[PDB]
Design a protein around this ligand. Sequence first.
Ligand SMILES: CC(=O)N[C@H]1[C@@H](OP(=O)(O)O)O[C@H](CO)[C@@H](O)[C@@H]1O
Ligand SMILES: [Mg+2]
Length: 472
Amino acid sequence: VKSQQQIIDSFKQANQDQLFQYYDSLTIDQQQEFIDQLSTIEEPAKLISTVEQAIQRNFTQLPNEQTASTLDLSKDILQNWTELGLKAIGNGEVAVLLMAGGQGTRLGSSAPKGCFNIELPSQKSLFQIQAEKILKIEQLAQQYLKSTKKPIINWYIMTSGPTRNATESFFIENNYFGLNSHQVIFFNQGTLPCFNLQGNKILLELKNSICQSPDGNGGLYKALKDNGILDDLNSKGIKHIHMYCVDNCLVKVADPIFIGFAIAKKFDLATKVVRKRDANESVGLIVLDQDNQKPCVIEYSEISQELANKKDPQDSSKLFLRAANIVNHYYSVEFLNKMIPKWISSQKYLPFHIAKKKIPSLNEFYKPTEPNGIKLEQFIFDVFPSVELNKFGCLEVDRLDEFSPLKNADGAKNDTPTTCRNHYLERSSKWVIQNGGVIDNQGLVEVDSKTSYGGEGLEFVNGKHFKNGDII
Ligand SMILES: CC(=O)N[C@H]1[C@@H](OP(=O)(O)O)O[C@H](CO)[C@@H](O)[C@@H]1O
Ligand SMILES: [Mg+2]
């Protein structure tokens, strides 16, 4: 490590003299704490350079050979992928990577987003729904293979540094929701300094502290390496990884169909999409970059308003680019072993993305009105074009069964606790009604994962009646 003076010199040489405006009026402990914080920043000179650089497109649809759809495949082909997936789960070759993010502040909660309660009749948090989803599929895999005990699906949860304790305590308080305490593994995501609007000066949060924020889901790769997560994957002999975001309340965790799909096709990388809701839906789009003939994702905050509304040449009723990204990825561990060192070393695969933000910080503190600074983010999918086109898979699935994100506080039209709650109940009710069950008009039921992972094993409800709010 470096001395007090050396950290100060390096930052000053990087033109961050403003970080030391009040240094001399700080107590010694405040100075030492400041230096320690500035120490966690690897290569400030580079980083400030990278940011500076980051401040200063032909797409088409994915070739047909790289796509498949759960809405079009025969039940036999889907069953075969399900079996290939349950076998991998059953052999202990499947692990899950969760991007937990940080606090559900935007939703009106200080707690981690995974603790959010969408008010289902069971009152189960997002974390609990995903945990029972995992427990359930482990049992279905055990049944398929006829094993004496259920297989284990290690669940690596990436938390932000500030939500780490509250996330782990929540799991402990709940006895891990039925999972083995050793299969829930927590690791912290990194952070990046926040900059002023011109992106040349790091912002002071306090007179002895800089503004920092989670470095985006794209920072998952470096966090994996640094926290020994990739090491663990090798030590446990894991071959397949399913990665998703905690805000999707309908998420099929460790979905065997998605894994079977990658296995059947021998893909290094694969991703899930659903038909775009509307031209303005804030959703990334999976396309083929015609320039380099590589798959990629165009984020909603960076796509041309012209491309977003472009109609499809072979059909005027459809949007040309309509394969919406639902942050649901598959990686083979072999691919991660080969590519992670590459992805984390050069900005070519993980360029920084700039987002203007209202950031509470020194002018004396103050919570601003208009944007006053910038947050930096690496996007998880920026590595997609580093894959070989024929090793990439894109699986379209049904939005009604697989995607309903919690993004906004109640009040908004889309992606609120209410839309999640209703879509969740509507799916449960559809499964029940579809198996002969009868729900009393105006009623919606909730299906417990313990009962059904994704609609199977519900035949027993044939003829039975249910009342609004029953849990099945
Ligand atoms: C970098 C990233 O992962 N962006 C994702 C993510 O958007 P956010 O609103 O930034 O969380 O979720 C969307 C699905 O809700 C997906 O379409 C988009 O591509
Ligand atoms: Mg296809």
